[PDB]
Amino acid sequence: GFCGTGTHIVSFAINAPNGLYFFHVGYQPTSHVNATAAYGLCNTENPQKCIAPIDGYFVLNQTTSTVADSDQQWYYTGSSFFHPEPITEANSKYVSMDVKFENLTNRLPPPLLSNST
Amino acid sequence: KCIAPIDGYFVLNQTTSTVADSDQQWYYTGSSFFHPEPITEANSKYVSM
Amino acid sequence: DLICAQYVAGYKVLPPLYDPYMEAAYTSSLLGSIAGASWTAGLSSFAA
Amino acid sequence: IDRLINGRLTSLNAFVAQQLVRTEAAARSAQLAQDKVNECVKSQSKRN
Ligand SMILES: *[C@@H]1O[C@H](CO)[C@@H](O[C@@H]2O[C@H](CO)[C@@H](O)[C@H](O)[C@H]2NC(C)=O)[C@H](O)[C@H]1NC(C)=O
Ligand SMILES: *[C@@H]1O[C@H](CO)[C@@H](O[C@@H]2O[C@H](CO)[C@@H](O)[C@H](O)[C@H]2NC(C)=O)[C@H](O)[C@H]1NC(C)=O
Ligand SMILES: *[C@@H]1O[C@H](CO)[C@@H](O[C@@H]2O[C@H](CO)[C@@H](O)[C@H](O)[C@H]2NC(C)=O)[C@H](O)[C@H]1NC(C)=O
Ligand SMILES: *[C@@H]1O[C@H](CO)[C@@H](O[C@@H]2O[C@H](CO)[C@@H](O)[C@H](O)[C@H]2NC(C)=O)[C@H](O)[C@H]1NC(C)=O
Structure with missing residues (x-):
């Protein structure tokens, strides 16, 4: 809130009579979508591995709604613009287990895979 | 390879005190409540030596 | 506890800009903005 | 008189002159x- 409203991007300052005049350019949403999000994702393994998103959300790509729990295919989106993409080691991090995380048994991301090559 | 903790400490579980350097089993605790747990990739990061 | 010295001495106390309903609405806005409210990096998403 | x-x-x-300084203090x-x-x-806040 210190540099204007919204999400601050850039600011400029000019001279004014008796002082300084400031223009804060901020990012402002106009339309939005309602997305279904996960807190994190688990492995059902031993020892169990869990991931959480970096700067964004694990979402469903709900363009074709009313699907099943194996059709719970999860994607990553950034927090400021809805555009789903595959979950990788670039946009997730390993965390300790939490009871709110969804337990996945099929369609696993590559960070959540039992690594046998 | 060298690791450091994330938001916490590498501590001894020193309820059983007076051990040797071979019996230095290290654990992780978070910095606001003492509860030792195993060191993993979820509470450590790689650092330069 | 009235201020009757207004009408004798010649000054006036002006009422505030908002009424108690609007001040109550402001602090309920503050109370309901605590859970969630841009869970992540920016300020553009709102998680419930 | x-x-x-x-x-x-x-x-x-x-x-x-007293009311001007009190108004300026209240606006700061x-x-x-x-x-x-906004921060609490x-x-x-990340400010200790
Ligand atoms: C996101 O979800 C909310 C659910 O609360 C939607 O709000 C409803 O929208 C419909 C259509 O505009 C209204 O008839 C309802 O009265 C709204 N419900 C409430 C409780 O306000 C909202 O429209 C959804 N947004 C999008 C983009 O789909
Ligand atoms: C999420 O669903 C949308 C469907 O709305 C997918 O968008 C399609 O993407 C393919 C890319 O090969 C295009 O050929 C289609 O024209 C797109 N459809 C629409 C309506 O835009 C999107 O690809 C899905 N996301 C992921 C990661 O699979
Ligand atoms: C995913 O599976 C785990 C099993 O490890 C579930 O964790 C249990 O959660 C309950 C509360 O709902 C706790 O009382 C148990 O102690 C937890 N088990 C363990 C071993 O800690 C978890 O609820 C599941 N989550 C989902 C979303 O299905
Ligand atoms: C650190 O040492 C304490 C002993 O003080 C361990 O606590 C015991 O844990 C077992 C199983 O977890 C329990 O059955 C005992 O009742 C506990 N004893 C006490 C006094 O709390 C603790 O498990 C050790 N830490 C680790 C990570 O192994």
């Missing part, structure tokens, strides 16, 4: 209250 007139006009000038502290609402009620 002109003694009372000149003394009362000087007293009103002192009252006006309203800006501080806005910072407190609606976020987690």
Whole structure:
């Protein structure tokens, strides 16, 4: 809130009579979508591995709604613009287990895979 | 390879005190409540030596 | 506890800009903005 | 009567000069209250 409203991007300052005049350019949403999000994702393994998103959300790509729990295919989106993409080691991090995380048994991301090559 | 903790400490579980350097089993605790747990990739990061 | 010295001495106390309903609405806005409210990096998403 | 007139006009000038400084103080502290609402009620501050 210190540099204007919204999400601050850039600011400029000019001279004014008796002082300084400031223009804060901020990012402002106009339309939005309602997305279904996960807190994190688990492995059902031993020892169990869990991931959480970096700067964004694990979402469903709900363009074709009313699907099943194996059709719970999860994607990553950034927090400021809805555009789903595959979950990788670039946009997730390993965390300790939490009871709110969804337990996945099929369609696993590559960070959540039992690594046998 | 060298690791450091994330938001916490590498501590001894020193309820059983007076051990040797071979019996230095290290654990992780978070910095606001003492509860030792195993060191993993979820509470450590790689650092330069 | 009235201020009757207004009408004798010649000054006036002006009422505030908002009424108690609007001040109550402001602090309920503050109370309901605590859970969630841009869970992540920016300020553009709102998680419930 | 002109003694009372000149003394009362000087007293009103002192009252006006007091109210100006109090209004300016209150407008600075309203800006501080806005910072407190934005950084303590609606976020987690990183300021110790
Ligand atoms: C996101 O979800 C909310 C659910 O609360 C939607 O709000 C409803 O929208 C419909 C259509 O505009 C209204 O008839 C309902 O009265 C709304 N419900 C409430 C409780 O306000 C909202 O429209 C959804 N947004 C999008 C983009 O789909
Ligand atoms: C999420 O669903 C949308 C469907 O709305 C997918 O968008 C399609 O993407 C393919 C890319 O090969 C295009 O050929 C289609 O024209 C797109 N459809 C629409 C309606 O835009 C999107 O690809 C899905 N996301 C992921 C990661 O698979
Ligand atoms: C995913 O599976 C785990 C099993 O490890 C579930 O964790 C249990 O959660 C309950 C509360 O709902 C706790 O009382 C148990 O102690 C937890 N088990 C363990 C071993 O800690 C978890 O609820 C599941 N989550 C989902 C979303 O299905
Ligand atoms: C650190 O040492 C304490 C002993 O003080 C361990 O606590 C015991 O844990 C077992 C199983 O977890 C329990 O059955 C005992 O009742 C506990 N004893 C006490 C006094 O609390 C603790 O498990 C050790 N830490 C680790 C990570 O192994």
